[PDB]
From a paper:
Three receptor types have been highlighted: VEGFR3 (also called Flt-4) regulates lymphangiogenesis, VEGFR2 (KDR/Flk-1) is the primary proangiogenic receptor, whereas VEGFR1 (Flt-1) has been proposed as a regulator of VEGFR2. The three structures are similar and reveal a homodimer with interlocked hydrophobic surfaces buried at the interface and a divalent cation chelated by four histidine residues (two from each monomer). Importantly, the dimer interface involves residues that lie in the core of the hVEGFR1d2 surface that interacts with VEGF-A, VEGF-B or PlGF.
The structures of the P1, C2221 and I222 crystal forms were determined with four molecules, one molecule and three molecules in the asymmetric unit respectively. The Co2+ ion was coordinated through the Nε atoms of the imidazole groups of His147 and His223 on each domain and by two water molecules to form a square-based bipyramidal regular octahedron. The metal ion coordination site is octahedral for Co2+ and tetrahedral for Zn2+ and Cu2+. Superposition of one hVEGFR1d2 molecule of the Co2+-bound and Zn2+- or Cu2+-bound dimers resulted in a maximum rotation for the second molecule by 12° and a translation of 2.4 Å. Other divalent cations exhibited little (Co2+ and Cd2+) or no effect on the competition assay (Fe2+ and Mn2+).
Residue numbers in the entry:
A (entry chain C), B (entry chain A): 133 to 225
Write the structure that this text describes.
Amino acid sequence: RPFVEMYSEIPEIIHMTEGRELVIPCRVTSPNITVTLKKFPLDTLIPDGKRIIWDSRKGFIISNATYKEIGLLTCEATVNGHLYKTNYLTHRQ
Amino acid sequence: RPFVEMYSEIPEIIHMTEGRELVIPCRVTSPNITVTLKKFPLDTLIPDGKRIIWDSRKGFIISNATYKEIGLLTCEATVNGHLYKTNYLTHRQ
Ligand SMILES: [Co+2]
Ligand SMILES: [Co+2]
Ligand SMILES: [Co+2]
């Protein structure tokens, strides 16, 4: 179990507001775990300065959410040869 | 194409309120299609024409939603020997 909260089967719903900070709360149980953030079904989002921040204690922080962040966001981690996914469905508050 | 709108990969978000009407809008392309309503992963919900009403042009109308209807609801239909599914995720504001 690399993720503290794991929504593999049914995604967790999270509210966002355009123009405001959005946390994708896939924090991990250990600092060695490598996490990838995806937006279904095409995009891989990488940590980048202040736009997208990774904090292993919190998850990914998107500094100012836009309508582009509306949809299915997935955190992925590979450990002990297995792939673990945790899924979030965002929509406006 | 038994369901007019088909949500498989990503379920469609439905806002619900306990004690109020809840519509699961899995309308179908013919009134001769039989549809079953399920709650993941265990339950089947049986329409009785009063508390839960089926209307092929609308979907399932649940009169008095309870917390038991919070979660992943699935409409299933078997036509021409094949099973089709469409998925809804109900959500409390
Ligand atoms: Co295994
Ligand atoms: Co066939
Ligand atoms: Co909402």
